[PDB]
């Protein structure tokens, strides 16, 4: 309500990630803006520690579902905006089939007039010549459905979805996502009926930018309840 009101216009975003995969440490900073009226996010990420040791598409999901567009009839099911400005904790395990896994913990909250996603990522059991550390992912992204259920026992939501990563040999590498979101503030909140976020992502580059980087555009609309 008051939380939803914070998203009526364009909101600045900052993202910060500290990461360690198979011992390779790295850091990413991002900035951009979100317009939840349209379900639209635009971000730019720079690896501030040099070369990113994993492919950029593997971090798209880690890099703010409060910017989803919830249609009018579904607005009572938007956990993410209600929890603002105090925010929520998002945790994932991401299993790359026949490879290693990411574990992430993020806090998503407002710092001033800015929505901030601060993340820590640890990745283990990857193959040094597999698709991830070997950089065999196409620089692109497909559409997915993010399935959300209430987790009443934990005052939050649990989320599951499977990302399809296109590989340079024409194959597809599946990344199973297991996600939980818990409010940062205390007190029981209203939790949604089962629904999903229709998510579309487009990755691009700034051709003058010489640092290792990703430009990410996202379009996210909630769906899956009767109209």
């Amino acid at each position: 309500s008051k939380g939803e009101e914070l998203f009526t216009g364009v909101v600045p975003i900052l993202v910060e990630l500290d990461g360690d995969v198979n011992g390779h440490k790295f850091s990413v900073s991002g900035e951009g803006e979100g317009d939840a009226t349209y379900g639209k996010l635009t971000l730019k990420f720079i690896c501030t520690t040099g070369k990113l040791p994993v492919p950029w598409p593997t971090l798209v999901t880690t890099f703010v579902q409060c910017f989803a567009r919830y249609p009018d009839h579904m607005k009572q099911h938007d956990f993410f905006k209600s929890a603002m400005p105090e925010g929520y904790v998002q945790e994932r395990t991401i299993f790359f089939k026949d490879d290693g896994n990411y574990k992430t913990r993020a806090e998503v909250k407002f710092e001033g007039d800015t929505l901030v996603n601060r993340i820590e990522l640890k990745g283990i059991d990857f193959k040094e010549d597999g698709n991830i550390l070997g950089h065999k992912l196409e620089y692109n992204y497909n559409s997915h459905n993010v399935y959300i259920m209430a987790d009443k026992q934990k005052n939050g939501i649990k989320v599951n979805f499977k990302i399809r990563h296109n590989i340079e040999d024409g194959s597809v590498h599946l990344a199973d996502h297991y996600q939980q979101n818990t409010p940062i503030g205390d007190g029981p909140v209203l939790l949604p009926d089962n629904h999903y976020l229709s998510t579309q992502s487009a990755l691009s580059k700034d051709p003058n930018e010489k640092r290792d980087h990703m430009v990410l555009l996202e379009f996210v609309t909630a769906a899956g309840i009767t109209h």
Epitope: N145, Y147, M149, D193, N194, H195, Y196, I225, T226
Partner: nanobody, 124 residues
Framework: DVQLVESGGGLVQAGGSLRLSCTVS????????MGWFRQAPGKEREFVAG????????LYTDSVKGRFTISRDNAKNTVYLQMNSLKPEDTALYYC?????????????????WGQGTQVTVSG
């Protein structure tokens, strides 16, 4: 809480096909894992097919594998059971069932809610 109404049943010749429907009224359809069961006179209800709330995970009893398809339309409160290559042994009263989903999977049992059923008769 929720009410289930089956339809699409009838008589068809062995090798024919039928599409059953189950319409869910009341609470939010996407909250429920959905299943189809079938019963021959005097025998028990046996599980036929089950679908997760998301539609992404399905289960089938062996004897219908590759002939029946369960699917759902979460915006239309309906689950369907496409039954192809029907055999006389498929003759039965077909029940729709529902259960508040605990996770993202389908389930074979422990359904709380039941329709009255739609008759399917496969002539031999």
């Amino acid at each position: 809480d929720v009410q289930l109404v089956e339809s699409g049943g009838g008589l068809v010749q062995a090798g024919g096909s039928l599409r059953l429907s189950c319409t869910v009224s009341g609470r939010t359809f996407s909250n429920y894992a959905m299943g189809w069961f079938r019963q021959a006179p005097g025998k028990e209800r046996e599980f036929v097919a089950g679908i997760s709330w998301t539609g992404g995970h399905t289960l089938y009893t062996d004897s219908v594998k590759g002939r029946f398809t369960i699917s759902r339309d979460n915006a239309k409160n309906t689950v369907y059971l496409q039954m192809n290559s029907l055999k006389p042994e498929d003759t039965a009263l077909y029940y729709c069932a529902a259960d508040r989903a605990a996770d993202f999977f389908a389930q074979r049992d422990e359904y709380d809610y039941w329709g009255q059923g739609t008759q399917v008769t496969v002539s031999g």
